[PDB]
């Protein structure tokens, strides 16, 4: 798929601004960032760590303003 | 009040499953972690599994692990524990308790116990008792031994000797089957004059026996 050339105008800029919040375990309603208190399997065998001891990857899926050739190109971020 | 009631303990026989049951009143039981206690007969307490509010995690003392299964229905405000390939050493009153707080840091205390229901794991099948006398203040009494399972009644005269009457509890023997005494301390005066008898009853096995008990 091959890139041409940038659209120019003050139509052709778009900015998505959020916040990701992080996902750590959650191991009970008041400790929203925090996991559940480690605890070590005695042996590689039996480790098996429940979910609120793990934390995980945040991901969010912005929708940006529709185009139909055009697409979105993410150029800076802060 | 906060409340907790068990139900469906009983006895079962060593390899197969029992499931206990306890239901919450007067909290939020989706906003609390769970637990089982046990204690064996005439022993402490040990702290056996822990569920957390949502349901999804669990842990378990090393003594019951792969063997308990904690589990709970948010919708029913329902605790389950769930025992499986069961050793006569798991025998015990299973308590559920209310987490006091401290799930999460690792800091388990219960401030909320349920009456606790008996789990009995024994391979002896049902049995009535032999009752033999202990014959002769003096005492006299009765022995009713080997029956299966808990419990048995014992009255005197059939209710009419109550004073000076001692039932002791229980005892396991070798052989599984429980044997239990009974006695009365009596005038020695009396031990011609008056007929000492001791009712036994066995729901479990249905039998009633009455015993004379003279020197």
């Known amino acids: 798929v091959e890139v041409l050339e940038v659209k120019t105008g003050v139509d052709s800029i778009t900015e998505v601004e959020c916040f990701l919040t992080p996902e750590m375990g959650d191991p009970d309603e008041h400790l929203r960032g925090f996991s559940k208190s480690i605890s070590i399997s005695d042996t590689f065998e039996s480790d098996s760590p429940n979910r609120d001891m793990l934390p995980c990857y945040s991901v969010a899926r912005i929708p940006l303003p529709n185009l139909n050739i055009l697409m979105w190109e993410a150029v800076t971020l802060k | 009040e906060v409340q907790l009631v068990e139900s469906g303990g009983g006895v079962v026989q060593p390899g197969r499953s029992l499931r206990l049951s306890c239901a919450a009143s007067?909290?939020?039981?989706?906003?609390?972690?769970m637990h089982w206690v046990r204690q064996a007969p005439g022993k402490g307490l040990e702290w056996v599994a822990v569920?957390?509010?949502?349901?999804?995690?669990?842990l378990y003392a090393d003594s019951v692990k792969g063997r308990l299964t904690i589990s709970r229905d948010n919708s029913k405000n329902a605790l389950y524990l769930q025992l499986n390939s069961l050793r006569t050493e798991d025998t015990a009153v299973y308590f559920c308790?209310?987490?006091?707080?401290?799930?999460?840091?690792?800091?388990?205390?219960?401030?909320?116990w349920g009456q606790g229901t008996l789990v009995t794991v024994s391979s002896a099948s049902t049995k009535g008792p032999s009752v033999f006398p202990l014959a002769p203040t003096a005492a006299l009494g009765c022995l009713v031994k080997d029956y299966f399972p808990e419990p048995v009644t014992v009255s005197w005269n059939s209710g009419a000797l109550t004073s000076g009457v001692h039932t002791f509890p229980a005892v396991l023997q070798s052989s599984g089957l429980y044997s239990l005494s009974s006695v009365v301390t009596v005038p020695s005066s009396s031990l011609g004059t008056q007929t000492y008898i001791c009712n036994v009853n066995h729901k479990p096995s249905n039998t009633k026996v009455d015993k004379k008990v003279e020197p």
């Open positions: 308790a209310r987490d006091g707080g401290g799930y999460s840091f690792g800091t388990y205390f219960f401030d909320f």
């Open positions: 007067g909290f939020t039981f989706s906003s609390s972690a």
């Open positions: 569920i957390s509010y949502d349901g999804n995690n669990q």
